[PDB]
Design a protein around this ligand. Structure first.
Ligand SMILES: O=P(O)(O)O[C@H]1[C@H](OP(=O)(O)O)[C@@H](OP(=O)(O)O)[C@H](OP(=O)(O)O)[C@@H](OP(=O)(O)O)[C@H]1OP(=O)(O)O
Ligand SMILES: Nc1ncnc2c1ncn2[C@@H]1O[C@H](COP(=O)(O)OP(=O)(O)OP(=O)(O)O)[C@@H](O)[C@H]1O
Length: 1011
């Protein structure tokens, strides 16, 4: 099977079929350089059955700056690189059988041994050898998937070749869409109309299936190719021979296999299918490909890479590139700058770019071994020329190696920028999947390793769980239930002994703002967020905007990822970007009229919360507010009203006393949820009732419920009964054993249970989507008397003791599979689904939807971490606006889009006065300084007269209010009454617009000093 506790988050990304295909697959990886190590790490974290790492190079001091598993002892002993890293790699995932190899590769090497590997990845291999290996691999039956990846300084090359014909079983991996049908016309071709404000969002040529269609019963169960006509309509083909449309209908998107044609590596070198990553330079990938091919030819010709600063070598490389360009089909122009920089940084190696390319290549390997997504076709050329482009023309002496571990990075970015990196003060927020990779990149780049000023602060309150080991490679199984930051710091210190780190456990929130005051942010140079929610992102961005400090943001949703770069005085902040809010499920839809499995899952989750967390909390709070039941009864008899008293009384009268009573209560709850509710709803609205227009009320998207008869033999009913009984026993503190969960024991208990007869009641049911949950309806006197009688009976029965007035409150924990929370939610959701004839969902989908688990995989995390590290380098260098690039990537397509970061927008108020979001105004005063003096000072310093003073919720001054015109004479200390904690106070000021009737135009925040 599949270890769900470890692969829970990856299971949603890939699927159990892809997971089973990931086993039984043997992957051969060669080179074990900086890039090969990243690829191997990502693959082992993914969970491939067996990986064979192979290398022949001996470890060197230069390798320490690129390999995060090597140590100085390995260099001393001159061990093989694969042998040295084999022990560490295997510990990442014990399920993976990792083996090392050292068989030499050359012209005469026999390639017969590669037939046992599904996929082959080659790094740091000579080009003719790659050609021969690819030719052998693609000619096998079945073809062996070939992937080649290389990194030379700041330039990278990625290649894929999955045989002549590769069968993709899933083009995108998105959830199939469901489109509700409004009306279908009998025509050749017929036209299908969707419901209003429900765009189908479909593409011409896709195949759809139909069900629950009245009139055209033939269309049910059939598959038709469609042509898009309008956002709410499309054509499916001839429908004249069918019966006229009545009502109803659901169309479901159908996924089909797709065939992708690749080509041999030898032929691809002349007509490359490069993937465009920057639409502003569509022809850049072709030029980069030409330059790298010229570099390979230079290596073949001279047996060495070009020397940095040797003009003759650069001229020779340019000549070779010019010669190569003519042989290309398109004959593109040779980019002198790209060739020159490739010559300059040929011998270097950039760690973040290596990590990004490793993530992409690992995703491609997974595509090769599973067919889950559309593979790359065929070349991907990532580059980081922006890092050195802003440097202009530096001297060669800044790039010469100096013997330390940072020679690889120095040969790329020069000594000056390396020194600037070592003195950074980085405040890294959150230490999740992205945080660990960012720490690894920091250790590789030497960030904060200086003994003078460098310092890294990482803060995180969570604890390590088993499911986190799949993505966060810095953690180990023995680290479970330990702080994330401490473990990450301990591991990073192992990676680079010189690094300075300072872990924290505080959660970044306004409650902890005292620790992370303004001075602390002033000390920091770069702030990086690895958060998973939105509110924390907005809070951190607001703090950074207040303190004028650059912020880097990133996030991953499965194969999707995005990076955002925020720079003071240059780019818009995160708060300036506002997405539409979350999709609120209508209250009427959730409560009474579900239409999809998501609605039932949400209803089950809310029912669980209300039954086991909210209601017990109310019960405990009520019984702690008052002494005992006698006092409450006396108050009620005197006419006193208490909040939620009747509900508490009802709960007390139904408290189970033993396991049998708990089972009976679960049975009654089942009957109420899935038998009485449907009958009540049908009684309120019969199946054949119609509206004023004559249309059936029970039409799409509403679905008519049907009662469910209890049956212990049904596995679903038994599962629900068991889970409900266990949860109720836990809440009411009733001991039980597994024998009590047996079907026979439950049947014996249920033999004596009498089922109360259902009786319909007159209740108002909200049907409009705009309706929401109303407040508490006042309770009639008869219900009050019933509650009084029940409470008196409980008191007289001596069942109101202290033990009876307390009951434990459960917390919804989803990762713990033995508590039965997810089992109960799944049982309730499926049972409700059968009530409304909705398709049931399995346990894992319910766990994902109810728990709001965000799918995530290691490869996307590594890629976004590498890109964020590149942007951090750019920020540290203080480069101009054009250098920074926001990134959005979706490896499922695959697609990578680099775009310029959003330019800061200037907002004008009056007389040409303009301000940015980064601007903050300062005012100084004294004790007798009045509001009129404040207005005069503002109009003097900035030329604009204030007309609106706000401090949060405080209403300070408006000239138009009838009675507050006198406030101009009031001093600040009396107008706002500020706290004495600080010497200044922040205010929000607006000015009257040039056109009357409009609200005063808000201005930049203004900080007023009391002295
Ligand atoms: O408190 P809620 O989570 O909103 O659930 C309540 C509650 O049902 P449970 O106690 O079974 O969870 C009501 O029962 P009381 O505790 O008030 O007796 C029940 O009312 P009825 O038993 O009278 O049907 C009502 O259902 P409704 O609003 O349809 O009357 C139902 O609400 P939901 O199940 O829709 O949440
Ligand atoms: N306000 C905050 N301050 C500090 N750390 C935060 C804050 N909000 C979230 N975090 C951290 O963000 C991290 C997010 O990590 P990640 O995205 O890998 O998921 P996770 O929390 O480990 O779990 P899962 O992926 O299962 O939801 C968590 O470790 C959490 O501690």
């Amino acid at each position: 099977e599949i270890d769900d506790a470890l692969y829970s988050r990856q299971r949603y990304v890939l699927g159990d079929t892809a997971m089973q295909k990931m086993a039984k697959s043997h992957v051969f990886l060669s080179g074990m350089g900086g890039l090969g190590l990243e690829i191997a790490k990502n693959l082992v974290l993914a969970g491939i059955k067996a990986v064979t790492i192979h290398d022949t190079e001996k470890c060197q001091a230069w390798d320490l700056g690129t390999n995060f598993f090597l140590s100085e002892d390995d260099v001393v002993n001159k061990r093989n690189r694969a042998e040295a890293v084999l022990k560490h790699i295997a510990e990442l995932n014990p399920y993976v059988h990792v083996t090392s190899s050292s068989v030499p590769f050359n012209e005469t090497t026999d390639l017969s041994f590669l037939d046992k590997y599904q996929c082959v990845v080659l790094t740091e291999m000579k080009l003719p050898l790659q050609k021969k290996i690819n030719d052998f691999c693609r000619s096998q039956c079945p073809p062996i998937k070939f992937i080649s990846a290389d990194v030379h300084g700041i330039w990278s090359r990625l290649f894929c070749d999955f045989g002549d014909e590769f069968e993709v079983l899933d083009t995108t991996g998105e959830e199939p869409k469901e489109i509700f049908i409004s009306n279908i016309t009998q025509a050749n071709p017929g036209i299908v109309t969707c419901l209003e404000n429900h765009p189908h969002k479909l593409e011409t040529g896709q195949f759809l299936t139909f069900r629950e269609i009245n009139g055209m019963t033939g269309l049910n169960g059939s598959i038709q190719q469609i042509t898009v006509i309008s956002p709410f309509s499309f054509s499916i083909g001839d429908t004249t021979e069918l019966e006229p449309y009545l009502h109803g209908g659901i169309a479901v998107q159908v996924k089909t296999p797709k065939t992708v044609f690749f080509e041999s590596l030898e032929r691809q070198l002349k007509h490359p299918k490069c993937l465009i990553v920057d639409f502003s330079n569509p022809e850049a990938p072709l030029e980069i490909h030409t330059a790298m091919l010229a570099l390979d030819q230079f290596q073949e010709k001279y047996s060495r890479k070009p020397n940095v600063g040797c003009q003759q070598d650069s001229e020779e490389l340019l000549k070779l590139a010019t010669s190569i360009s003519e042989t290309l089909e398109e004959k593109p122009d040779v980019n002198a700058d790209i060739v020159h920089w490739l010559s300059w940084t040929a011998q270097g190696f950039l760690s973040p770019l290596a990590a990004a390319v490793g993530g992409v290549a690992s995703q491609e390997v997974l595509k090769a071994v599973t067919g889950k997504f559309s593979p790359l076709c065929q070349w991907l050329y990532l580059e980081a020329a922006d890092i050195v482009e802003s440097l202009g023309k530096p001297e060669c002496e800044e790039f010469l190696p100096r013997g330390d571990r940072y020679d690889a990075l120095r040969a790329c970015i020069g000594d000056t920028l390396c020194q600037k990196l070592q003195n950074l003060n980085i405040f890294l927020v959150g230490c999740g999947a992205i945080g660990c990779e960012m720490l690894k990149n920091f250790a590789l780049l030497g960030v904060g390793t200086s003994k003078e000023k460098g310092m890294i602060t990482v803060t995180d309150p969570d604890l390590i769980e088993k499911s986190n080991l799949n993505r966060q490679f810095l953690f180990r199984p023995h680290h479970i239930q330990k702080p994330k930051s401490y473990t990450a710091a301990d591991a990073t210190l192992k990676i680079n002994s010189q690094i300075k780190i300072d872990a924290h456990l505080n959660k970044v929130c306004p409650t902890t703002e005292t620790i992370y005051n303004d001075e602390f942010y002033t000390k920091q140079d770069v702030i990086i967020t690895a958060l998973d929610n939105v509110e924390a992102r907005r809070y951190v961005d607001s703090r950074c905007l207040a303190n004028l400090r650059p912020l880097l943001d990133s996030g991953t949703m499965g194969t999707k990822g995005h990076t955002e770069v925020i720079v003071p005085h240059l780019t818009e902040s995160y708060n300036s970007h506002r997405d539409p809010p979350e999709e609120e499920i209508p209250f009427s839809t959730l409560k009474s009229f579900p239409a999809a499995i998501e609605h039932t899952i949400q209803w089950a989750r809310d029912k669980f919360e209300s039954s086991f967390s909210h209601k017990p909390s109310l019960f405990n709070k009520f019984w702690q507010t008052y002494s005992s039941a006698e006092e409450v009864l006396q108050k009620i008899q005197s006419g006193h009203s208490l909040e939620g008293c009747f509900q508490v009384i009802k709960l007390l009268s139904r408290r189970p006393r033993n396991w049998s009573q708990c089972v009976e209560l679960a049975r009654l709850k089942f009957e109420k949820y899935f038998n009485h509710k449907a009958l009540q709803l049908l009684h309120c609205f019969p199946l054949d009732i119609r509206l004023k227009d004559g249309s059936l009320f029970w039409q799409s998207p509403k679905r008519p419920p049907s009662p469910i008869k209890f049956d212990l033999n049904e596995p679903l009913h038994l599962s629900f009964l068991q889970n409900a009984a266990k949860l109720y026993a836990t809440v009411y503190c009733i001991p039980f054993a597994e024998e009590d969960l047996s079907a026979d024991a439950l049947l014996n208990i249920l033999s004596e249970v009498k089922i109360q007869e259902f009786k319909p009641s007159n209740k108002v049911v909200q049907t409009d989507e705009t309706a929401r949950k109303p407040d508490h309806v006042p309770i009639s006197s008869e219900d009050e008397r019933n509650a009084i009688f029940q409470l008196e009976k409980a008191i007289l029965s001596n069942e109101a003791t202290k033990s009876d007035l307390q009951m434990a409150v459960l917390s919804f924990e989803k990762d713990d599979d033995h508590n039965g929370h997810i089992d109960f939610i799944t049982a309730a959701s499926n049972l409700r689904a059968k009530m409304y004839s909705i398709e049931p969902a399995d346990r894992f989908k319910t766990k994902r939807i109810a728990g709001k688990i965000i799918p995530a995989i290691a490869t996307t995390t590594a890629t976004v971490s590498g890109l964020v590290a590149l942007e951090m380098i750019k920020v540290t260098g203080g480069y101009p606006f054009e250098a920074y690039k926001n990134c959005f990537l979706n490896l499922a397509i695959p697609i990578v889009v680099f775009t310029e970061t959003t330019e800061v927008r200037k907002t004008k108020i009056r007389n040409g006065i303009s301000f940015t979001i980064w601007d903050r105004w300062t005012v100084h005063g004294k004790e007798d300084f009045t509001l009129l003096d404040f207005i005069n000072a503002v109009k003097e310093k900035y030329g604009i007269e204030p007309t609106m003073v706000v401090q949060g919720v405080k209403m300070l001054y408006v000239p138009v209010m009838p009675g507050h015109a006198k406030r101009l004479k009031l001093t600040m200390h009396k107008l706002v009454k500020p706290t004495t904690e600080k010497k200044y106070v922040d205010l929000t000021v607006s000015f009257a617009p040039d056109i009357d009737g409009d609200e005063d135009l808000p201005g930049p925040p203004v900080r007023y000093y009391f002295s």
